């Protein structure tokens, strides 16, 4: 029986899914299954934990927004049905750009923590990485904690370290495969929830 990992926590949690062909279609299903497992362990509500789910390729698609006032069961259904892209490129810079200038353009919930879970399995072409550091620093200034999850041997290690070295909060998780997500799930959620503040008594 599932239990609320973030109980009494105030958190905006953003899931960023690598949409490149570095993940097979089945592997991408495992990634999505991970996201759903995560959501199952959260109390999704505007008053507690809010979620966002974005799949990024050369561009990005936001399947779920933080303000989307749909029932949790619906949000989890949407996440599990995110379409496989299998794009040649997954632009981390573009999706961090979207996270900075769209999702967190306005901080309407300052009393909550903001966490961006960047699930990476690829490495964007260098020409697309010109403004990467700027987006990462912009997110830091808005008190958005970016947590990189490097999956597989093709994950952009340089960018993972660039995010990690900013602050101890930006702890990076490294996995050899999507298959390892389930085993490290509870650890990851616990780390996330530990960063989130509690509601006052
Ligand atoms: Ca492979």
GROMACS .gro file of C-alpha atoms and ligand atoms in nm:
model
  202
    1UNK     CA    1   0.000   0.000   0.000
    2UNK     CA    2   0.137   0.339  -0.109
    3UNK     CA    3   0.209   0.617   0.141
    4UNK     CA    4   0.253   0.992   0.091
    5UNK     CA    5   0.630   1.060   0.082
    6UNK     CA    6   0.593   1.440   0.089
    7UNK     CA    7   0.329   1.448   0.361
    8UNK     CA    8   0.263   1.807   0.471
    9UNK     CA    9   0.526   1.935   0.224
   10UNK     CA   10   0.479   2.236  -0.005
   11UNK     CA   11   0.637   2.157  -0.340
   12UNK     CA   12   0.619   2.237  -0.711
   13UNK     CA   13   0.768   1.937  -0.891
   14UNK     CA   14   0.856   1.952  -1.261
   15UNK     CA   15   0.929   1.635  -1.460
   16UNK     CA   16   1.151   1.682  -1.766
   17UNK     CA   17   1.157   1.377  -1.995
   18UNK     CA   18   1.426   1.311  -2.257
   19UNK     CA   19   1.250   1.261  -2.590
   20UNK     CA   20   1.546   1.145  -2.798
   21UNK     CA   21   1.614   0.816  -2.975
   22UNK     CA   22   1.882   0.737  -2.717
   23UNK     CA   23   1.591   0.572  -2.539
   24UNK     CA   24   1.409   0.291  -2.716
   25UNK     CA   25   1.031   0.309  -2.711
   26UNK     CA   26   1.020   0.045  -2.436
   27UNK     CA   27   1.286   0.234  -2.239
   28UNK     CA   28   1.081   0.552  -2.266
   29UNK     CA   29   0.785   0.357  -2.127
   30UNK     CA   30   1.002   0.269  -1.826
   31UNK     CA   31   1.088   0.638  -1.784
   32UNK     CA   32   0.718   0.727  -1.794
   33UNK     CA   33   0.640   0.445  -1.551
   34UNK     CA   34   0.897   0.599  -1.317
   35UNK     CA   35   0.723   0.938  -1.338
   36UNK     CA   36   0.387   0.775  -1.260
   37UNK     CA   37   0.537   0.585  -0.964
   38UNK     CA   38   0.664   0.920  -0.836
   39UNK     CA   39   0.324   1.088  -0.872
   40UNK     CA   40   0.155   0.797  -0.693
   41UNK     CA   41   0.367   0.878  -0.388
   42UNK     CA   42   0.267   1.245  -0.382
   43UNK     CA   43  -0.041   1.434  -0.264
   44UNK     CA   44  -0.110   1.623  -0.585
   45UNK     CA   45  -0.301   1.943  -0.510
   46UNK     CA   46  -0.268   2.320  -0.545
   47UNK     CA   47  -0.234   2.336  -0.166
   48UNK     CA   48   0.038   2.070  -0.136
   49UNK     CA   49   0.237   1.924  -0.427
   50UNK     CA   50   0.187   2.057  -0.780
   51UNK     CA   51   0.327   1.871  -1.080
   52UNK     CA   52   0.434   1.949  -1.434
   53UNK     CA   53   0.531   1.700  -1.705
   54UNK     CA   54   0.729   1.809  -2.009
   55UNK     CA   55   0.867   1.593  -2.289
   56UNK     CA   56   1.152   1.760  -2.474
   57UNK     CA   57   1.305   1.695  -2.814
   58UNK     CA   58   1.425   1.977  -3.040
   59UNK     CA   59   1.128   2.158  -2.890
   60UNK     CA   60   0.920   2.070  -2.585
   61UNK     CA   61   0.562   1.964  -2.513
   62UNK     CA   62   0.401   2.043  -2.177
   63UNK     CA   63   0.150   1.765  -2.112
   64UNK     CA   64   0.084   1.883  -1.757
   65UNK     CA   65   0.110   2.232  -1.611
   66UNK     CA   66   0.143   2.322  -1.243
   67UNK     CA   67  -0.189   2.507  -1.248
   68UNK     CA   68  -0.375   2.228  -1.428
   69UNK     CA   69  -0.652   2.158  -1.177
   70UNK     CA   70  -0.724   1.803  -1.289
   71UNK     CA   71  -0.771   1.510  -1.050
   72UNK     CA   72  -0.444   1.325  -0.964
   73UNK     CA   73  -0.569   1.005  -1.130
   74UNK     CA   74  -0.614   1.201  -1.453
   75UNK     CA   75  -0.271   1.362  -1.425
   76UNK     CA   76  -0.112   1.019  -1.383
   77UNK     CA   77  -0.304   0.889  -1.686
   78UNK     CA   78  -0.178   1.179  -1.897
   79UNK     CA   79   0.180   1.114  -1.787
   80UNK     CA   80   0.159   0.743  -1.874
   81UNK     CA   81   0.031   0.828  -2.222
   82UNK     CA   82   0.299   1.081  -2.319
   83UNK     CA   83   0.386   1.010  -2.683
   84UNK     CA   84   0.727   0.867  -2.772
   85UNK     CA   85   0.923   1.107  -2.991
   86UNK     CA   86   1.243   0.919  -3.072
   87UNK     CA   87   1.393   1.245  -3.196
   88UNK     CA   88   1.757   1.264  -3.300
   89UNK     CA   89   1.807   1.543  -3.045
   90UNK     CA   90   1.681   1.619  -2.696
   91UNK     CA   91   1.764   1.980  -2.616
   92UNK     CA   92   1.829   2.027  -2.246
   93UNK     CA   93   1.893   2.396  -2.310
   94UNK     CA   94   1.555   2.448  -2.476
   95UNK     CA   95   1.360   2.272  -2.202
   96UNK     CA   96   1.548   2.459  -1.927
   97UNK     CA   97   1.466   2.772  -2.125
   98UNK     CA   98   1.099   2.673  -2.122
   99UNK     CA   99   1.114   2.591  -1.750
  100UNK     CA  100   1.271   2.929  -1.670
  101UNK     CA  101   1.069   3.161  -1.894
  102UNK     CA  102   0.731   2.982  -1.900
  103UNK     CA  103   0.673   2.747  -1.607
  104UNK     CA  104   0.844   2.976  -1.358
  105UNK     CA  105   0.801   3.309  -1.537
  106UNK     CA  106   0.599   3.412  -1.234
  107UNK     CA  107   0.650   3.272  -0.885
  108UNK     CA  108   0.291   3.258  -0.765
  109UNK     CA  109   0.376   3.009  -0.491
  110UNK     CA  110   0.677   3.142  -0.295
  111UNK     CA  111   0.599   2.940   0.019
  112UNK     CA  112   0.672   2.619  -0.170
  113UNK     CA  113   0.994   2.462  -0.296
  114UNK     CA  114   1.045   2.437  -0.671
  115UNK     CA  115   1.220   2.131  -0.812
  116UNK     CA  116   1.304   2.048  -1.172
  117UNK     CA  117   1.381   1.681  -1.226
  118UNK     CA  118   1.585   1.671  -1.547
  119UNK     CA  119   1.582   1.315  -1.679
  120UNK     CA  120   1.867   1.293  -1.929
  121UNK     CA  121   1.972   1.014  -2.164
  122UNK     CA  122   2.134   1.213  -2.444
  123UNK     CA  123   2.361   1.502  -2.540
  124UNK     CA  124   2.232   1.792  -2.752
  125UNK     CA  125   2.443   1.930  -3.038
  126UNK     CA  126   2.691   2.190  -2.911
  127UNK     CA  127   2.538   2.477  -3.111
  128UNK     CA  128   2.226   2.440  -2.896
  129UNK     CA  129   2.422   2.472  -2.572
  130UNK     CA  130   2.522   2.839  -2.607
  131UNK     CA  131   2.277   2.961  -2.344
  132UNK     CA  132   2.272   2.652  -2.120
  133UNK     CA  133   2.455   2.800  -1.821
  134UNK     CA  134   2.241   3.116  -1.839
  135UNK     CA  135   1.922   2.912  -1.802
  136UNK     CA  136   2.068   2.711  -1.514
  137UNK     CA  137   2.169   3.030  -1.329
  138UNK     CA  138   1.833   3.188  -1.405
  139UNK     CA  139   1.664   2.889  -1.245
  140UNK     CA  140   1.895   2.916  -0.944
  141UNK     CA  141   1.806   3.283  -0.895
  142UNK     CA  142   1.436   3.193  -0.896
  143UNK     CA  143   1.513   2.935  -0.625
  144UNK     CA  144   1.436   2.649  -0.862
  145UNK     CA  145   1.643   2.345  -0.767
  146UNK     CA  146   1.754   2.156  -1.077
  147UNK     CA  147   1.822   1.789  -1.013
  148UNK     CA  148   1.982   1.605  -1.306
  149UNK     CA  149   1.920   1.234  -1.350
  150UNK     CA  150   2.179   1.099  -1.592
  151UNK     CA  151   2.048   0.783  -1.755
  152UNK     CA  152   2.266   0.561  -1.972
  153UNK     CA  153   2.607   0.619  -2.134
  154UNK     CA  154   2.492   0.899  -2.366
  155UNK     CA  155   2.373   1.143  -2.098
  156UNK     CA  156   2.539   1.485  -2.125
  157UNK     CA  157   2.793   1.448  -1.846
  158UNK     CA  158   2.931   1.801  -1.893
  159UNK     CA  159   2.591   1.958  -1.841
  160UNK     CA  160   2.518   1.729  -1.546
  161UNK     CA  161   2.832   1.853  -1.371
  162UNK     CA  162   2.759   2.214  -1.467
  163UNK     CA  163   2.428   2.190  -1.283
  164UNK     CA  164   2.568   1.988  -0.990
  165UNK     CA  165   2.856   2.223  -0.904
  166UNK     CA  166   2.624   2.519  -0.839
  167UNK     CA  167   2.499   2.403  -0.499
  168UNK     CA  168   2.481   2.088  -0.284
  169UNK     CA  169   2.104   2.084  -0.348
  170UNK     CA  170   2.172   2.018  -0.716
  171UNK     CA  171   2.275   1.660  -0.640
  172UNK     CA  172   2.300   1.454  -0.957
  173UNK     CA  173   2.175   1.098  -0.986
  174UNK     CA  174   2.358   0.868  -1.227
  175UNK     CA  175   2.195   0.552  -1.360
  176UNK     CA  176   2.330   0.299  -1.610
  177UNK     CA  177   1.979   0.233  -1.742
  178UNK     CA  178   1.611   0.326  -1.713
  179UNK     CA  179   1.572  -0.019  -1.557
  180UNK     CA  180   1.749   0.112  -1.246
  181UNK     CA  181   1.490   0.388  -1.190
  182UNK     CA  182   1.252   0.166  -0.992
  183UNK     CA  183   1.525   0.056  -0.752
  184UNK     CA  184   1.635   0.414  -0.682
  185UNK     CA  185   1.285   0.564  -0.689
  186UNK     CA  186   1.221   0.576  -0.314
  187UNK     CA  187   1.566   0.724  -0.255
  188UNK     CA  188   1.504   0.996  -0.515
  189UNK     CA  189   1.157   1.091  -0.385
  190UNK     CA  190   1.291   1.106  -0.030
  191UNK     CA  191   1.572   1.336  -0.139
  192UNK     CA  192   1.320   1.558  -0.318
  193UNK     CA  193   1.080   1.572  -0.024
  194UNK     CA  194   1.363   1.650   0.218
  195UNK     CA  195   1.429   1.972   0.024
  196UNK     CA  196   1.064   2.079   0.053
  197UNK     CA  197   0.932   2.281   0.349
  198UNK     CA  198   0.660   2.161   0.585
  199UNK     CA  199   0.329   2.333   0.651
  200UNK     CA  200   0.321   2.526   0.982
  201UNK     CA  201   0.124   2.368   1.272
  202LIG    CA1  202   2.094   0.168  -2.601
   0.00000   0.00000   0.00000
